[PDB]
């Protein structure tokens, strides 16, 4: 796991080639590339939405057409084997390509992108092959009926698009595309990846400001005004492109009704209004979602720990996803078969109304929790009138989907747990509204669609412990400003009550790989956490030493006692053995001469003194995108060097 | 005093005392055929004469229609149009809106056969479910044919939905006709086999 | 031998339906007749009270008539009658027991008849603007008095608002009675002087500094 | 114009003061303080809104009861005298307490808060006397009939609360409270003024994230996570407190329908939706907004340059504030009097209807553009049925209100410019939608109430040229995410077109005062040409007496002295700490050898560093000193933020 030098070199050749462009088309190209990132991320979101809609429509039409045929004849056992096989055939195809070709495209990409924006480079995270495999794999994973979502993998897809088109070079088609030539640093590419992950969040939920605050949480740096204004531009382009194309697919072009991939609706119907006296009630919900999120993360920790040791061959972790894909169908059919309540039409509240043993004008209502998208089930657990749900079928769908969503997340498929967490939470929140509207009688403040929202926020905050960006996504996705005050209380409590037990879902899976991962602040002076065998280098260095020092310490400070003069990298020494260092930028490759590296080295590296405290050396290293920090004496003698592996330990 | 400020001129008065005769009769027909729902087939011509007598005067359209803050002749024809569209009485009528559709006249004939077979095949209700089931199946299949044919253009007509509601509620409850469905042993035998495969996979890969 | 109400109603329960059909059909007639010369709240008041009475007489076979299909004709017809009666604000006249016209609006209608017969008796409309202003002013003052009294218990009942609308349309236009209002030279003299003060202030502050 | 040290010294006494605490209550007290800042800012907004609502409602009934008394008898010039006299009598009191008592309350305090969060302390910005004069100055200048708004000076007001209750004392009344002695460190104080300015923005507009983005931009520091989350907590409690208390004041407690002082209403009306073929129409409204914002800034700059000299005694400032308020009465009366058209009083759309020369059911339509709070005018220019505005009436109203607002901004009253900018922009923006509803023949996409929204943002972005926080305020006030893309293109275009003429309004009033203000952003100029060569260094064990001579130069002000011992750098000592030592809780009580007391690890740069590398370190950490050194640690020059402002 290598780092990226987000601090720029600023050598003699950077200062010379900074001239003859100021002697301003570089700033225009950045806005052009950010507009391209927004358009391409919105179009990939449209492609996923359309293909998933049509393929899942075909599958549910085939499966429904075989249940309705076998009901009066009597062969319903052969209709279970159709849906146990149609699920196990899409998931078989969508898991061979993840286990055998690219295992970095497994799960949601949010831990990998979250480690990229700190600076850790997981080796194959932003290639084109990862984009192809993750897009087709999330399609085959959603169609094949796993208890997963599809909005989580939009962040990784958008940031892979952003790392791809910013370089202007494919490195997969063996092409050059002599157009950009300037944005091939690690200080530019990390900013473009930040804009792409923001556009991914914006198309995933319909919330551009939440995507900006997502990309500002990770990559905690100094404030850059123009960078955040480009990031906001890319997020707006992303939401607009998704909405504009999904309007002209439904054949209206005027309404623009779908800003993101999930659309919560409008929360202003005068039954939605809350009051101050139920502000304690919401706090109680934040405790319940903090307990249940800890149970989810604990049960998922003890299963990933099983799977790392015992199920790690690629053939043997394709077979596990096939069995989980068959078992979700089996448990769904068993709960559909044995249920009792039936229901007439409510105007498209089912979308595939299955009459199984009902009364010929009614339809089975356990089969409506299944056979829908989880999106439509969440949108209908909000906004429905009271009396719409039986507490037995809803509470038995809730209990089962919890364990199906907990047993599915560590699989080797492309997937996500936003929409599972929102559906687990909106279900017991809707049950909470039922018991409140039963205790108080037919009240008005006891609206179950108001408490389904607070339960979804509580469960999503308890599982994914994430507050500042998720609150803004919630407050913007419901389009009500007065709702942010209960929601951010609910997300505060669910963090606190969660963090006493277990870590957090995206953080536990960062820790379960040996990843450095600098945190927000320090949990000691610089003399304790440095590295004294530093092995510095002379300005007029006799070569032959350089090929022996280089043949683990990617950065070498340049000295001469021995006074500090600057830093040199491993890559620039190989290139010497400003457009040549950037030409050879992807994938860096007697004895007597002399090498005078006086015009290639960083002339002013950041240095901390020997007595400086740990929250001071950690503040500069985390905000400035540093990978090396020199510790000097009082006579500017270099003793010790601070890298990320020195700071990520404590 | 000039016309239209205190009173009305008698021609445009007589175009108000005529529309008043057609709304009273239409409200009477609507409530008299309200509950045994014969709505779209009894007074379609009364709705036609009201929607004709409205446009008789819309083209003194200002001496009657736009002269108050509460426009009685305007907001009452909007009631009649909203009720006629919520009923979907266009489905029970032709393209010319002059007679019943060729499909509805075949439904309401077949519905009469089913209700005259129910009350005749009766002396329990263990004889009604036999020898009468062939009528219920063809009636329900015809209904589901009409429903998708109406879906091809974009609720059915309320005159035929109420007939199908009455005969489904008369068949399912109050007669308790049902099918046996001896199918709960092979489903249990298969769904106990598939749920057993994960505890074989997790246990074989733990040992070996 | 069929069960009751499912193919065909009870015998006593369609008596209620036909009796509601008689009187909710009369009200639509009296509501279109008493519509353009707006005498709505003062003629349809005995016929609105019996339609809402017969509607409560079928609530104490309610499920046989009111809740038996997706489109409930009796319920929505009674809702139409209520939302028309609450838009006309016919409860602002008919004071408190809905049994007679209020003794603040029968005075208005008497005075309205007196104002219109004073218009048509005194008949360019030069002699109408004189000699007949005293009735119009007391009619307008009575209307504004009832209108400011109604807020403390936003529209009066449609009879008195349409009567006042008619006499405003007849006094303002078609007669063109208007006050002369020769007040524009003191207004222009006061407004030119105040607009000249910033010139004096800024100029003398520029010069003598 | 004294600087502000935002980085802690982290000296030895700091470390023993931190160890005794961490062997945790000093983090939960920040949340208690930020909750109190939110509650108090929302309550000050409630007080301002209720008092201005009741006092202006008493003035327009005296005037309507006087106009509708002389309109049939004769003698309307008395009513003009009465209205000019009431406006003069309110603005006399409202400007005699700014001009004589405390002249820093003048205007909105947004340039003073920007200079504070950028680290420059203007001598009275956070003081209880400044709060009382500004809150009662807003009320007396908004009631007094000026063309001003009350939403600007909520950002300043709440900041004055935030720096008051954190350092928990009263320097005015000399009353002490041992509650928050820890939070008196001037690192904490700039953190709380961020929370208070954010909560002021959120109670002003109903925009909590626009407040948080307002605090993040101004005060462009390193990303602090817990700070940002406390700021957002303060903004949410601010807007909830305002909404709750105004709802229990209006009656119907369970109707939380007032998040801010201006409430735009929701744009989900299904005819307010835009399309893609009217996006380059919105690019043209940004250019018109930028040109008109440049004209506003030019005319106001020449007014202010006429008013820096020639009108600078407080007495002339009071007389000028009165003569503006008497002219805005007579200009409004001459427009009301000569206006012909009048409307039949549809609903609750006038609130003081004047049947001046109209026919007993009709009330004058020009008289409702005046006689009416500008919030209600801006909200009624949005989502209104077409055919509601005569174009000559809005033409005359927009023409004279553009100049009355431009002539009122530099006065010595407490006043905002957000609401007149929104009213100008919503007014000519509605005319542009009327003229497209004429050409296209009343098409559905040419709805005039939608173009009032884009003209409003165009004019506000053209006059005051802030984006990325103005954009997010507009999305949360319209409550419509799909509008954020046209509003962003409008604001971008208006800023780009306005910047090629004249700077923004707040930047202009910042730079007319001789402040050392830093921007957000010249690699060819290294840090060798930026340092100040005369460097007076102290020693580690320096004898007392030359410390008194170094502090007693009275020919060169200095507040930072590097400690040396060749002369190799050892650290940095301040002036205030050194005055305390010449007579770490004995250093905070005085807050409004020297080896143990000096900052041991100051931030340094070598002399070959570039200026964007120096400016990135100095702005984002909030420094007031930066020691430039040689190849070894010998000191050559030092940076004290005059040198970065002068270039
Ligand atoms: C007074 O009479 C006028 C007509 O003379 C009424 O104006 C009508 O108002 C409705 C809705 O406000 C419009 O749909 C009509 O088109 C208007 N009529 C005309 C001729 O334009 C007005 O509402 C009446 N006022 C009252 C209180 O009854
Ligand atoms: C079939 O009949 C049932 C009742 O016999 C109808 O159900 C009623 O529906 C309305 C609104 O849809 C409810 O307000 C009533 O309460 C329901 N009645 C009962 C007894 O629950 C149903 O709508 C009818 N279906 C059709 C298609 O007409
Ligand atoms: Cl997801
Ligand atoms: Cl996810
Ligand atoms: Cl303002
Ligand atoms: Cl301002």
UniProtKB/Swiss-Prot annotation, chain B:
Disulfide bonds: none
Keyword Metal-binding on entry: no
Record: glycosylation sites: 21, 56, 81, 95, 102, 112, 124, 165, 176
Record-level GO BP terms: osteoclast differentiation; transepithelial chloride transport
Disease named in the record: Osteopetrosis, autosomal recessive 5: A rare genetic disease characterized by abnormally dense bone, due to defective resorption of immature bone. Osteopetrosis occurs in two forms: a severe autosomal recessive form occurring in utero, infancy, or childhood, and a benign autosomal dominant form occurring in adolescence or adulthood. Recessive osteopetrosis commonly manifests in early infancy with macrocephaly, feeding difficulties, evolving blindness and deafness, bone marrow failure, severe anemia, and hepatosplenomegaly.
Biological role: Required for osteoclast and melanocyte maturation and function.
Name the UniProt record assigns to this protein: Osteopetrosis-associated transmembrane protein 1
The species this protein was found in: Homo sapiens (Human)
Organism phylogeny: Eukaryota, Metazoa, Chordata, Craniata, Vertebrata
Name of encoding gene: OSTM1
Swiss-Prot record, chain D:
Catalytically driven reaction(s): 2 chloride(in) + H(+)(out) = 2 chloride(out) + H(+)(in)
Membrane-spanning ranges: 31-63, 78-101, 127-145, 151-168, 226-245, 279-309, 314-336, 391-411, 416-439, 483-501
Motif (Selectivity filter part_1): 107-111
Membrane topology category: Multi-pass membrane protein
Keyword tags: Antiport, ATP-binding, CBS domain, Chloride, Disease variant, Ion transport, Lysosome, Membrane, Nucleotide-binding, Osteopetrosis, Phosphoprotein, Repeat, Transmembrane, Transmembrane helix, Transport
Residues that coordinate or bind chloride: 108, 418, 506
Effect of substituting residue 624 to W: In OPTA2 and OPTB4
Record's function text: Slowly voltage-gated channel mediating the exchange of chloride ions against protons. Functions as antiporter and contributes to the acidification of the lysosome lumen and may be involved in maintaining lysosomal pH. The CLC channel family contains both chloride channels and proton-coupled anion transporters that exchange chloride or another anion for protons. The presence of conserved gating glutamate residues is typical for family members that function as antiporters.
Pathology linked to this chain's protein: Osteopetrosis, autosomal recessive 4: A rare genetic disease characterized by abnormally dense bone, due to defective resorption of immature bone. Osteopetrosis occurs in two forms: a severe autosomal recessive form occurring in utero, infancy, or childhood, and a benign autosomal dominant form occurring in adolescence or adulthood. Recessive osteopetrosis commonly manifests in early infancy with macrocephaly, feeding difficulties, evolving blindness and deafness, bone marrow failure, severe anemia, and hepatosplenomegaly.
PANTHER family: CHLORIDE CHANNEL PROTEIN CLC FAMILY MEMBER, H(+)_CL(-) EXCHANGE TRANSPORTER 7
Subunit structure: Chloride channel 7 are heteromers of alpha (CLCN7) and beta (OSTM1) subunits.
Protein name (Swiss-Prot/TrEMBL): H(+)/Cl(-) exchange transporter 7
Source organism per UniProt: Homo sapiens (Human)
Taxonomic lineage from the root: Eukaryota, Metazoa, Chordata, Craniata, Vertebrata
């Amino acid at each position: 796991y290598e780092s990226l030098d987000y601090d720029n070199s600023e050598n003699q050749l950077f200062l010379e080639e900074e001239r003859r462009i100021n002697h301003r088309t570089v700033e225009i190209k950045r806005w052009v590339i950010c507009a391209l990132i927004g358009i391409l991320t919105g179009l990939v979101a449209c492609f996923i939405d359309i293909v998933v809609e049509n393929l899942a429509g075909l599958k549910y039409r085939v499966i429904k057409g075989n249940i309705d045929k076998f009901t009066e004849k009597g062969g319903l056992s052969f209709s279970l084997l159709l849906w146990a096989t149609l699920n196990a055939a899409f998931v078989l195809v969508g898991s061979v390509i993840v286990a055998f070709i690219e295992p970095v495209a497994a799960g949601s990409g949010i831990p990998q992108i979250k480690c990229f924006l700190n600076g850790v480079k997981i080796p194959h995270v932003v290639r084109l092959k990862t984009l192809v495999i993750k897009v087709s794999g999330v399609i085959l994973s959603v169609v094949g009926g796993l208890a997963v979502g599809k909005e989580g993998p939009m962040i990784h897809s958008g940031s892979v698009i952003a790392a791809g088109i910013s370089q202007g070079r494919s490195t997969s088609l063996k092409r050059d595309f002599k157009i950009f030539e300037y944005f091939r640093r690690d200080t530019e590419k990390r900013d473009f990846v930040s804009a792409g992950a923001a556009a991914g969040v914006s198309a995933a939920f319909g919330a551009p400001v939440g995507g900006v605050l997502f990309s500002l949480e990770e990559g905690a740096s100094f404030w850059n005004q123009f960078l955040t204004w480009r990031i906001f531009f890319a997020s707006m382009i992303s939401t607009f492109t998704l909405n504009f194309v999904l309007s002209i697919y439904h054949g209206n072009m005027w309404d623009l009704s779908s800003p993101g991939l999930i659309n919560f609706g409008r929360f202003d119907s005068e039954k939605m209004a809350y009051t101050i006296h139920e502000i304690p009630v919401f706090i109680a919900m934040g405790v319940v979602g903090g307990v249940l999120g800890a149970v989810f993360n604990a049960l998922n920790y003890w299963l990933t720990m099983f799977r790392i040791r015992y199920i790690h061959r690629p053939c043997l972790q394709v077979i596990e996803a096939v069995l989980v894909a068959a078992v979700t169908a089996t448990v769904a059919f068993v709960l559909i078969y044995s249920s009792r309540d039936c229901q007439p039409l409510q105007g498209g509240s089912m979308s595939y109304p299955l009459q199984l043993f009902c009364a010929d004008g009614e339809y089975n209502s356990m089969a409506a929790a299944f056979f829908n998208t989880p999106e439509k089930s969440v949108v209908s657990l909000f906004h429905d009138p009271p009396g719409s749900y039986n507490p037995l079928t809803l509470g038995l769908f809730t209990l089962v989907y919890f364990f199906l969503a907990c047993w599915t997340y560590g699989l080797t498929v492309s997937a996500g747990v936003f929409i599972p967490s929102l559906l687990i939470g909106a279900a017991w929140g809707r049950l909470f509204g039922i018991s409140l509207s039963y205790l108080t009688g037919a009240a008005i403040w006891a609206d179950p669609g108001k408490y389904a929202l607070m339960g979804a926020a509580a469960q999503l905050g308890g599982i994914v412990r994430m507050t500042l960006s998720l609150t803004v996504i919630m407050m913007e996705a419901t389009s009500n400003v007065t709702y942010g005050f209960p929601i951010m209380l609910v997300l505060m409590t669910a963090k606190i009550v969660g963090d006493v037990f277990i870590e957090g879902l995206y953080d536990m899976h960062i820790q379960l790989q040996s990843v450095p991962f600098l945190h927000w602040e320090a949990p000691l002076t610089a003399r304790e956490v440095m590295s004294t065998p530093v092995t510095c280098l002379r300005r007029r260095e006799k070569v032959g030493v350089i090929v022996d020092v280089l043949s683990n310490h990617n950065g070498f400070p340049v000295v001469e006692p021995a006074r500090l003069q600057g830093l040199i990298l491993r890559s620039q020494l190989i290139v010497l053995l400003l457009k040549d260092f950037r030409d050879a930028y992807p994938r860096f490759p007697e004895r007597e001469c002399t090498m005078d590296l006086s015009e290639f080295m960083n002339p002013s590296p950041y240095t901390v003194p020997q007595e400086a405290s740990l929250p001071r050396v950690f503040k500069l290293f985390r905000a400035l995108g540093l990978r090396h920090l020199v510790v000097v004496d009082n006579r500017n003698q270099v003793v010790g060097l601070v890298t990320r592996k020195d700071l990520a330990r404590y | 005093l000039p016309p239209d400020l205190p009173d009305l001129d008698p021609e445009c008065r007589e175009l108000l005392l005529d529309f008043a005769n057609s709304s009273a009769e239409l409200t009477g027909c609507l409530v008299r055929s309200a509950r045994p729902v014969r709505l779209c087939q009894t007074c379609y011509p009364l709705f036609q004469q009201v929607v004709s007598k409205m446009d008789n005067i819309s083209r003194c359209a200002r001496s009657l229609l736009m002269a108050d803050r509460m426009q009685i002749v305007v907001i009452l024809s909007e009631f009649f149009n909203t009720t006629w569209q919520e009923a979907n009485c266009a489905n029970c009528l032709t393209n010319n809106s002059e007679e019943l559709s060729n499909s509805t006249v075949y439904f309401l004939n077949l519905f009469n056969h089913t209700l005259t077979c129910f009350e005749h095949n009766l002396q329990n209700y263990s004889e009604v479910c036999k020898n009468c089931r062939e009528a219920y199946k063809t009636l329900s299949s015809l209904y589901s044919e009409m429903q998708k044919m109406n879906e091809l253009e974009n609720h059915l007509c309320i005159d035929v939905e109420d007939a199908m509601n009455i005969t489904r509620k008369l068949w399912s409850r109050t007669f308790n006709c049902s099918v046996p469905c001896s199918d709960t042993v092979p489903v249990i035998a298969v769904s106990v086999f598939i749920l057993f495969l994960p505890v074989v996979f997790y246990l074989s890969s733990f040992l070996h």
